[PDB]
Design a binder for these strands. Structure first.
Ligand SMILES: [Mg+2]
Ligand SMILES: [Mg+2]
Ligand SMILES: [Mg+2]
Ligand SMILES: [Mg+2]
Ligand SMILES: [Mg+2]
Ligand SMILES: [Mg+2]
Ligand SMILES: [Mg+2]
Ligand SMILES: [Mg+2]
Ligand SMILES: [Mg+2]
Ligand SMILES: [Mg+2]
Ligand SMILES: [Mg+2]
Ligand SMILES: [Mg+2]
Ligand SMILES: [Mg+2]
Ligand SMILES: [Mg+2]
Ligand SMILES: [Mg+2]
Ligand SMILES: [Mg+2]
Ligand SMILES: [Mg+2]
Ligand SMILES: [Mg+2]
Ligand SMILES: [Mg+2]
Ligand SMILES: [Mg+2]
Ligand SMILES: [Mg+2]
Ligand SMILES: [Mg+2]
Ligand SMILES: [Mg+2]
Ligand SMILES: [Mg+2]
Ligand SMILES: [Mg+2]
Ligand SMILES: [Mg+2]
Ligand SMILES: [Mg+2]
Ligand SMILES: [Mg+2]
Ligand SMILES: [Mg+2]
Ligand SMILES: [Mg+2]
Ligand SMILES: [Mg+2]
Ligand SMILES: [Mg+2]
Ligand SMILES: [Mg+2]
Ligand SMILES: [Mg+2]
Ligand SMILES: [Mg+2]
Ligand SMILES: [Mg+2]
Ligand SMILES: [Mg+2]
Ligand SMILES: [Mg+2]
Ligand SMILES: [Zn+2]
Lengths: 115, 75, 135, 177, 51, 66
RNA sequence: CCGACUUACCAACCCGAUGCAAACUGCGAAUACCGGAGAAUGUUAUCACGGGAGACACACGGCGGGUGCUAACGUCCGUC
RNA sequence: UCCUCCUAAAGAGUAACGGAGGAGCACGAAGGUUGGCUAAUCCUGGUCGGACAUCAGGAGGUUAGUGCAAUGGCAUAAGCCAGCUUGACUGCGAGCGUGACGGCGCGAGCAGGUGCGAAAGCAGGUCAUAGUGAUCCGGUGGUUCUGAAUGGAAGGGCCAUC
RNA sequence: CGUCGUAGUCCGGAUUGGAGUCUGCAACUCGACUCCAUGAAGUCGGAAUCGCUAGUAAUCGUGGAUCAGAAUGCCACGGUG
RNA sequence: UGCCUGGCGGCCGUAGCGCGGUGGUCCCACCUGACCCCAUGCCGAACUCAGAAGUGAAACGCCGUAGCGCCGAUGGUAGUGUGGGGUCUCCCCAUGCGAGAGUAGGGAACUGCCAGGCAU
RNA sequence: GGGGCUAUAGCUCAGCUGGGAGAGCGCCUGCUUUGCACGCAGGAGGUCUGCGGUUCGAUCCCGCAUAGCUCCACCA
């Protein structure tokens, strides 16, 4: 099922790397959710956020839900806005644009990452 | 007899080999399948023609897991 | 006689016959007949040499035919002009290079193998020699 | 509900002890029950598929999937794409409730019953058994059926070798032999 | 062969028309799309008419 | 599940002659009175009789004896 | 009915060893070809434009091959 | 005549009454986009069910599929399912490939306007190569462009088109 | 008098399994009959053909000869007609 | 910084398969439940949403394993550019380039960036 | 070398934009007949020449072979 996840994911990744745009990749497990902004160097991250980090974790009863996704998305949008990245492209990485991932995208849009 | 016919050959192959300073939009490879996939600023056309999207030097590369033979364009 | 029971294409090119052979070692049996010349055997010649050596050893001990005719040679008929297509397919040949082991034999004395392969080599168009196994 | 709670109560304990499993997750579950009516004259006429849809709706409260042909054969004279059969997958609580109804009502109604066979176990665990007439379920009105049908049930369980599936259904006290 | 060439005429008052091909002996229904019409420069409706 | 597409499926009362009454979720619409349950079907005590072979030599020796 | 059992039977997938292929490639040279740098040399030998044509029946020899019979001072092509 | 492979000698070309094949179309969805999915065959078990319908599971990994002949491709799928739809749009086009020429083909981008998607983005027809016809003479629909004194008109031109 | 409701039926009774009684030295080949069960075909019959003129045709029973047991036949008798 | 795990890569089989062992504090997977947001040409399987009792069986990761796969020299051989010779359907000599298959052998990958855990 | 053909025991349609084998005769069995022909009534029928390909599937599409039928094998 992880190979099915990669099989859904890899189209947008190879097209976006062909384009040459700075990508905000997400990742969603049922307990935690991660994100990072990776430049078109392909292998070097810029800013990174996760709900494993305690500054983002000490604000809600559960760490794997929609509101903690909103918190980690607002945090990664703040860190990318601080390092100076304005337009990214949203790599949902095989997961549907729904639920926690949509809360992350809405949070980064309402915080300032204009993608 | 039954076997006179043959078509008129469609001039396939590679046109600019690697290291030839290409202009923008020029045709590198004419082919029928994607023998050569596209890479850093090469556009794949309708009949899998490879046209250089940007100026520079053609540079063939063999990347990817299944050893597919991509084409790039330097500057 | 000895022809392939099914083929992709009916008529084949002529082609040259240069280069040295492959099946030089006597793999299966013990006593082999190695073609030192270069030419084409046919189905007629292979069946003739096989039935000659079978008469020679009186059907005792195993025979091995190694090369098999699978290249069709065509012939235009008589009173036919040169044009109008490639001619009809008549018979089948087997290309031999210098070094090809044609027949092998075991379950026979050495001297009876010598006599048998002489008797069958005198019905083949290519010059052949005798050979034994090695290790 | 009753067999799911009883399975979590007693069958897990007995299977883990009598097969010496190290942890507790090694006991074989049941994951799906598949009902299938592969009807023949669906290409001779269409109305058999809606009557079979009513049939499987009565055997279980789902609406059945009208499955079609994969490849085109000729000894049955079906083309590629014709709707052949009708199936139902049951997973979880609906599977449990229908499984209880089957094991306590329906298999008491097979005509000339002498126990379900024991070779039918597909070498892995997944049970499979056909029932000749669909009337043996208590939900079929015998005075309403016009065309005799019949189906097969396929209980896919997640055992490793079918000796464990045999032990699981025997600890569920199936009527086998 | 069995194909019948038709013209999709405009709706927006022009005599403009595209040429298309309808299989006019197994799909009898009227074709009607929303195509560009370069005199109004606005994507308007185009109906199937007799060539 | 999808809401509309299925028929209804609710709990019924299956009373049988064997003393067994089962409130099980089913699709009949009303009450139900079973012929045989899983508690009275003659498999748990039937198959030792149900083939009924007997003995031919004892049939002989019953119908006459010397 | 169950065909129990076979005769020194045939025969498919498999595996082991053996060959062949213009219309086979899980491999793959030499030369050729294209593009860049360099030195020498060559009567600019290259390119574009304009005036004038001729020629479009070729032949044999070397190598690579297709008809043919690995026949022809045969025929049809590539390169010299 | 047009397309595919060989002939064809590792760029392109390259002949014969040389060797094998196909076309003279189909599609208002079989196109676009989004989202999802992965085959051939064989084994085992199973109601009518038979070597072969449907169902479960396995071994196998492109041995299948492409509307169609073969070749080159294809898993990011170009293959298979569903939603929404007309980019199967209009004017243009750097820069090339290809041919004696008529021609033929590939094209990032620009202006207008639209489709799908949340958005980045994709869409100027289909996996690609076949699916066809130069000129003349007319027909149909637009266009003040000329209108043989002037005002019209016939006719002619241009644009789409048989 | 009740029942049955035009159906393969409460029609038809074949065939098959079990259990039997009698006759007879002896019912397997090869008897009759009873009981229980099973309930095939058959839904009025093509071409053609037969019998009958009155107590006849049609339909329903009963007996005898032969005969240990073994007649849907043969020979007779009446009943409705 | 010592190791472990998650992510995105570099790379494309010395990197893949097989056999055996191992890890759950953390992470991950399985799991619990789903009228619900959302989904099924039927089905909370998938998709998704609420969550954390259990487990490390499966899956995933790590570790040993030459049973395969894979890589692979040195030499030799085939071939071939140029010049020459012969018994000229094929070769040979001077020279230049030198395969494929196989052999010795190699071989259970390596690496960058971030984040989290453990004493470090 | 080119057309057209091979289908019950013999003679013939049906191949016809690929999924039903259709008649008269020969034959079997009844009926009428002193019997046999004739007539009536009811019937089982056939490798669609064969062998491989071609799509799911070949009476149909293709190649090869067999077998009979016609047309052509001229100019010196
Ligand atoms: Mg050669
Ligand atoms: Mg050779
Ligand atoms: Mg080759
Ligand atoms: Mg000049
Ligand atoms: Mg000329
Ligand atoms: Mg000439
Ligand atoms: Mg000439
Ligand atoms: Mg010449
Ligand atoms: Mg020459
Ligand atoms: Mg030559
Ligand atoms: Mg020649
Ligand atoms: Mg000459
Ligand atoms: Mg010559
Ligand atoms: Mg070439
Ligand atoms: Mg060349
Ligand atoms: Mg997609
Ligand atoms: Mg089966
Ligand atoms: Mg598509
Ligand atoms: Mg398409
Ligand atoms: Mg195509
Ligand atoms: Mg003219
Ligand atoms: Mg004017
Ligand atoms: Mg005027
Ligand atoms: Mg009465
Ligand atoms: Mg009646
Ligand atoms: Mg009765
Ligand atoms: Mg009947
Ligand atoms: Mg009288
Ligand atoms: Mg008496
Ligand atoms: Mg008597
Ligand atoms: Mg779940
Ligand atoms: Mg494990
Ligand atoms: Mg070497
Ligand atoms: Mg080597
Ligand atoms: Mg290794
Ligand atoms: Mg390993
Ligand atoms: Mg007669
Ligand atoms: Mg047919
Ligand atoms: Zn009961």
């Amino acid at each position: 099922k992880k190979s099915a996840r990669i099989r859904r994911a890899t189209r947008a990744r190879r097209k976006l790397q062909e384009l040459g745009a700075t990508r905000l990749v997400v990742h969603r497990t049922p307990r935690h959710i991660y994100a990072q902004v990776i430049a078109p160097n392909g292998s070097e991250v810029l800013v990174a956020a996760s709900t494993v980090e305690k500054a983002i974790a000490e604000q809600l009863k559960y760490t794997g839900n929609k509101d903690a996704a909103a918190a980690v998305g607002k945090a990664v949008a703040e860190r990318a806005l601080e390092k100076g990245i304005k337009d990214v492209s949203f790599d949902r990485s095989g997961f549907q644009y729904h639920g926690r991932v949509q809360a992350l995208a809405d949070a980064a849009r309402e915080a300032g990452l204009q993608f | 007899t039954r076997n006179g016919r043959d078509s008129e050959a469609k001039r396939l192959g590679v046109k600019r080999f690697g290291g030839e300073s290409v202009l923008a939009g020029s045709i590198i490879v004419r082919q029928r399948g994607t023998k050569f996939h596209a890479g850093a600023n090469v556009g794949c056309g309708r009949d899998h023609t490879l046209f250089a999207k940007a100026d520079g030097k053609v540079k063939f590369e063999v990347k990817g897991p299944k050893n597919r033979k991509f084409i790039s364009i330097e500057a | 006689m000895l022809q392939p029971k099914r083929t992709k294409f009916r008529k084949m090119h002529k082609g040259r016959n240069r280069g040295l052979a492959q099946g030089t070692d006597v793999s299966f049996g013990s006593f082999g007949l190695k073609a030192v010349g270069r030419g084409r055997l046919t189905a007629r010649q292979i069946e003739a040499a096989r039935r000659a050596m079978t008469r020679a050893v009186k059907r005792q001990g195993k025979i091995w035919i190694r090369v098999f005719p699978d290249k069709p040679i065509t012939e235009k008929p008589l009173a036919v002009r040169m044009g109008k297509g490639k001619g009809n397919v008549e018979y089948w040949v087997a290309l031999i290079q210098p070094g090809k082991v044609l027949y092998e034999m075991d379950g026979v004395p050495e001297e009876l193998a010598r006599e048998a392969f002489k008797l069958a080599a005198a019905k083949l168009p290519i010059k052949t020699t005798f050979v034994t196994k090695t290790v | 509900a009753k067999l799911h709670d009883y399975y979590k109560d007693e069958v897990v304990k007995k299977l883990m002890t009598e097969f010496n499993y190290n942890s507790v997750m090694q006991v074989p579950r049941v994951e799906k029950i598949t009902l299938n009516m592969g009807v023949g004259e669906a290409i001779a006429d269409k109305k058999l598929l809606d009557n079979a849809a009513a049939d499987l709706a009565a055997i279980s409260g789902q609406k059945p999937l009208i499955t079609k042909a994969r490849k085109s054969v000729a000894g049955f004279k079906i083309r590629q794409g014709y709707p052949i059969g009708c199936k139902v997958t049951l997973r979880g609580e609906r599977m449990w409730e229908f499984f209880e109804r089957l094991i306590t009502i329906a298999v008491p109604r097979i005509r000339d019953f002498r126990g379900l066979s024991a070779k039918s176990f597909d070498g892995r665990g997944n049970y499979s058994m056909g029932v000749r007439e669909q009337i043996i379920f208590p939900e079929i009105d015998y005075d309403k059926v016009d065309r005799v049908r019949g189906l097969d049930i396929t209980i896919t369980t997640t055992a490793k070798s079918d000796e464990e599936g045999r032990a699981l259904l025997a600890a569920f006290d199936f009527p086998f032999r | 062969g069995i194909r019948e060439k038709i013209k999709l005429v405009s709706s927006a008052g022009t005599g403009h028309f595209y040429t298309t091909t309808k299989n006019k002996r197994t799909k009898p229904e009227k074709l009607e799309l929303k195509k560009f019409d370069p005199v109004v420069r606005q994507h308007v409706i185009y109906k199937e008419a007799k060539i | 599940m999808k809401k509309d597409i299925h028929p209804k499926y609710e709990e019924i009362t299956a009373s049988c002659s064997c003393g067994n009454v089962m409130k099980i979720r089913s699709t009949v619409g009303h009450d139900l009175n079973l012929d045989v349950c899983s508690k009275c079907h003659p498999f748990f005590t039937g198959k030792q009789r149900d083939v009924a072979t007997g003995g031919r030599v004892d049939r002989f020796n019953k119908r006459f004896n010397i």
